[PDB]
Amino acid sequence: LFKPNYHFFPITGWMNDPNGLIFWKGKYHMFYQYNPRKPEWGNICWGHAVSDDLVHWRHLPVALYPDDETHGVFSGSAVEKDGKMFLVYTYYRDPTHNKGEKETQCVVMSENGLDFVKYDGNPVISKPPEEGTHAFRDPKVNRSNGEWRMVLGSGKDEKIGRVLLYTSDDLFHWKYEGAIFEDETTKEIECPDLVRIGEKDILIYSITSTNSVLFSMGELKEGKLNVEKRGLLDHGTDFYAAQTFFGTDRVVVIGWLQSWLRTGLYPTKREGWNGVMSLPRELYVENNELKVKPVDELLALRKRKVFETAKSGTFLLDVKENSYEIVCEFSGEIELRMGNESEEVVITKSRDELIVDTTRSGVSGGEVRKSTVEDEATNRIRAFLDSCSVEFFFNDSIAFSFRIHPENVYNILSVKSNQVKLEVFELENIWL
Ligand code: NA
Missing domain, CATH: 2.115.10.20 (Glycosyl hydrolase domain; family 43)
Known part of the structure; x- marks a missing residue:
């Protein structure tokens, strides 16, 4: 797995x-x-x-x-x-x-x-x-x-x-x-x-x-x-x-x-x-x-768009594996959750601060990490989820990388913000 x-x-x-x-x-x-x-x-x-x-x-x-x-x-x-x-x-x-x-x-x-x-x-x-x-x-x-x-x-x-x-x-x-x-x-x-x-x-x-x-x-x-x-x-x-x-x-x-x-x-x-x-x-x-x-070449991994929304909510993702990219544009604050009924990773922009919580991510637990960030008129989070990792990129400027070990597919996504635009791309297996 x-x-x-x-x-x-x-x-x-x-x-x-x-x-x-x-x-x-x-x-x-x-x-x-x-x-x-x-x-x-x-x-x-x-x-x-x-x-x-x-x-x-x-x-x-x-x-x-x-x-x-x-x-x-x-x-x-x-x-x-x-x-x-x-x-x-x-x-x-x-x-x-x-x-x-x-x-x-x-x-x-x-x-x-x-x-x-x-x-x-x-x-x-x-x-x-x-x-x-x-x-x-x-x-x-x-x-x-x-x-x-x-x-x-x-x-x-x-x-x-x-x-x-x-x-x-x-x-x-x-x-x-x-x-x-x-x-x-x-x-x-x-x-x-x-x-x-x-x-x-x-x-x-x-x-x-x-x-x-x-x-x-x-x-x-x-x-x-x-x-x-x-x-x-x-x-x-x-x-x-x-x-x-x-x-x-x-x-x-x-x-x-x-x-x-x-x-x-x-x-x-x-x-x-x-x-x-x-x-x-x-x-x-x-x-x-x-x-x-x-790097721009990572765009070649995108194999299909499986979900998109321009509204806050909680959504069932039609994905069968932890192999996907979240691209989310938003104004102001956000809470973005990805997970399933037992596990999740959460990223939150609250005022001045970007915070990531992997403590409930899977069988290795995780941690909370935080950074002060500069607001932009439109903010952008790009997240890459794979079998044992999640990497977050904020405003093409800052990166947070974490190892996680989920026992199941992260097929539930929840976003809360104004002016949300969010899409999910299934990402290719490079091996077979
Ligand atoms: Na030589």
């Missing part, structure tokens, strides 16, 4: 962070932290999928394996150089009784996107830059000012999380340019990604203790990010380790649609698998504000 209709998830075993996101030779490649052995983390490989359109994924062979039973191929990114695909990633060695973990940054190449070959001079970065650095991982490499730039996650002195910057002319030899950013709120920053949108430098990164993806927007000057604006990339309970695609026009992000904090609460394990990826979102800047919306 819980296998997603239109989100990416592994054929078996455990999946976490998206890796190596790249548009290369006309297709979107997605890799991921993978354990095929069982639906729990360990013995980490890079799984591999591809799509033409960011939506219709096809599984490919596992791309990268650890050399033995005490290593893992941890997170990283992908780049294109001389027409070839390069993956840059953290290679991890287990601690023993006497030694802590060891992390190095390595390179692999592919001419065809199927056969992946190790670079002979690995590791490309053998050690951290300063004493007392840990969580030294997740190289996100991009092109800037005629050079390669890599941002890396780290923590210093078990005290403060920081993003490290290296540069390179060739991808193999890297120069340390210092720590560009730190966050006192955590011991470690994971999965950084440094992007440029319309004259602004935007650093996206993840923090473990809160399972959140944050951004800091401003300008990179003199080896330091000057922050003008900070915020969350997603306001729900299950969005983590976001990464951006190399090689696209738009800034397109995918995150892991799960939380480490809530992982032991989830039931997909009983079906032999764990982990889901988020729908892709476009990041853009308007009126000096970072905004987040669903």
Whole structure:
């Protein structure tokens, strides 16, 4: 029952962070932290999928394996150089009784996107830059000012999380340019990604203790990010380790649609698998504000319109599965409920605040999350419901993502507002 209709998830075993996101030779490649052995983390490989359109994924062979039973191929990114695909990633060695973990940054190449070959001079970065650095991982490499730039996650002195910057002319030899950013709120920053949108430098990164993806927007000057604006990339309970695609026009992000904090609460394990990826979102800047919306390609999933109303009420939906999109335009306040006789998720706009309640959603319960929002003359909520998730998008600007595990189809919809226009689209199963 819980296998997603239109989100990416592994054929078996455990999946976490998206890796190596790249548009290369006309297709979107997605890799991921993978354990095929069982639906729990360990013995980490890079799984591999591809799509033409960011939506219709096809599984490919596992791309990268650890050399033995005490290593893992941890997170990283992908780049294109001389027409070839390069993956840059953290290679991890287990601690023993006497030694802590060891992390190095390595390179692999592919001419065809199927056969992946190790670079002979690995590791490309053998050690951290300063004493007392840990969580030294997740190289996100991009092109800037005629050079390669890599941002890396780290923590210093078990005290403060920081993003490290290296540069390179060739991808193999890297120069340390210092720590560009730190966050006192955590011991470690994971999965950084440094992007440029319309004259602004935007650093996206993840923090473990809160399972959140944050951004800091401003300008990179003199080896330091000057922050003008900070915020969350997603306001729900299950969005983590976001990464951006190399090689696209738009800034397109995918995150892991799960939380480490809530992982032991989830039931997909009983079906032999764990982990889901988020729908892709476009990041853009308007009126000096970072905004987040669903990627346009998701429109291709719409297979039929099953319901529409221009009035408040409670409605029986002619749907047989939890695989659908709500598009709702409204003025002022709203309460929107989706569910059945025993379960529901509720979203409410009340005055100044958007609030989402998944506590009664299904067999994993849920939580309440809230954000202050700006009113528009017409407000818009777009909701994607799949077998074990709901993702909400408000005014093409803010996103809330949640894992839920309903025991039954959410075939009851109720809306209350003035000037309501609401429609429901059945969404395609991408697998069969
Ligand atoms: Na190589």
